[PDB]
Amino acid sequence: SYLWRDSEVSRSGSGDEPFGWVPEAHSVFTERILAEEPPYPCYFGTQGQQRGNNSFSAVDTRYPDTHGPAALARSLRAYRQRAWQGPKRQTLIVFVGPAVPGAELADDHRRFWTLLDELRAYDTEPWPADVPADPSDPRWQWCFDGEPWFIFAASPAYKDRRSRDLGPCLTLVFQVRRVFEGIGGSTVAGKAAKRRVREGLARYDRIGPHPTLGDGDTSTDFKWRQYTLPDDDSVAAPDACPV
Ligand code: HEM
């Protein structure tokens, strides 16, 4: 395991034990995404939360042999199975802790890429034949358990891009392709989804949508850039993926 529904996340926690800080990270996350004024910009995530469609896990950096990447690989395999049954719009939120006071965005980003690397070692499935393995390829995406994931990193060090601050921990948000059924970027519903989320971003964030966010007319190349947005509108070089 370590794959939890909301009800299964423990009620309170003892900071010194493995995952003893998770109750607090979970409360702050749920407070952020359910906040009513201004609303959390992604109404899909809010609704996911309200319907009980979000799952959770964690990594405890102090207990790597038992509550680390290997256990997360097992939890992701279980999540992948859950995500292809029942409702289409599910998300997995993974808290990485304990929180490190003072951490900068660069540091959180470094930790994010290290974890993705480490998870690779615990994959039981080969890299998908239809996604290139070179991360400098325009079509590269992170893959695990035989398919590509949609993934991004949230951090308290986001000051203007407040939408990506989900509480005190480095937080990973994972989804399978299924969540986008009917809302592909090129469709009328997909465009409506973009308009609606971006209106929410305008009122919640102090900086506008990042330039690497697609208009949805073409497949977006160098998706890696979207996993770890900067807090400004700088655009990284397509070929500088850190994995
Ligand atoms: C807890 C779950 C979720 C969170 C925390 C979340 C968070 C976000 C954030 C922060 C953005 C703004 C763009 C960015 O920073 O990358 C975003 C945009 C978006 N999200 Fe979510 N989201 C969640 C679940 C979902 C689900 C389940 C779907 C679809 C069913 C979805 C669809 C979208 C779409 C379509 C956009 C807009 C992309 C654009 O304007 O180009 N999200 N989400």
Q: At 156, which amino acid appears?
A: P
Closest-CA residue, ligand 1 atom 11, reads: 42
Could you give the CA distance from residue 91 to residue 46 in angstroms, rounded to a whole number? Answer: 11
For the four alpha carbons of 156, 158, 159 and 163, in that order, the dihedral sign comes to negative
Tell me how crowded residue 155 is: count the other CB atoms within 10 A of its CB.
Answer: 25
Q: Is the CB of 91 under 6 A from ligand 1?
A: yes
Could you give the CA distance from residue 163 to residue 174 in angstroms, rounded to a whole number? Answer: 16
What b-and-e string marks burial along 187-217, b requiring 16 or more CB atoms within 10 Å of the CB? eeeebebbeebeebbeebbebebbebbeebe
DSSP category for residue 39? B
Mutate to test the pocket of ligand 1, among 152, 197, 213, 225 (most ligand atoms within 8 A of CB): 197
Structure tokens at 109: 């980003």
CA of 17 to the centre of ligand 1 (A): 32
Could you give the CA distance from residue 51 to residue 224 in angstroms, rounded to a whole number? Answer: 29
Query: Residues 154, 96: contact at Cβ < 8 Å?
Result: no
Give the method used: X-ray
Three-state SS string over 45-63 comes to: HHHHHHCCCEEEEEEECCC
Mutate to test the pocket of ligand 1, among 33, 44, 53, 203 (most ligand atoms within 8 A of CB): 44
Q: Is the CB of 200 under 6 A from ligand 1?
A: no
Closest-CA residue, ligand 1 atom 38, reads: 194
Bridge-based pairing state of the strands 91-97 and 147-148: unpaired
Query: Residues 109, 177: contact at Cβ < 8 Å?
Result: no
Instruction: Indicate which atom in ligand 1 lies nearest the CA of residue 166.
Output: 5
Could you give the CA distance from residue 131 to residue 114 in angstroms, rounded to a whole number? Answer: 21
Q: Which residues pair with 190 in a beta bridge?
A: none
Could you give the CA distance from residue 243 to residue 230 in angstroms, rounded to a whole number? Answer: 17
Which residues, 6+ apart, have CB-to-CB distance to 129 below 8 Å?
A: none
Gaps in the chain with C–N over 2.5 Å, residue before each: none
Q: Is the CB of 198 under 6 A from ligand 1?
A: yes
Where are the chain's structural domains? 6-227
Could you give the CA distance from residue 119 to residue 122 in angstroms, rounded to a whole number? Answer: 5
Instruction: Indicate which atom in ligand 1 lies nearest the CA of residue 179.
Output: 30
Could you give the CA distance from residue 212 to residue 84 in angstroms, rounded to a whole number? Answer: 28
Could you give the CA distance from residue 64 to residue 212 in angstroms, rounded to a whole number? Answer: 34
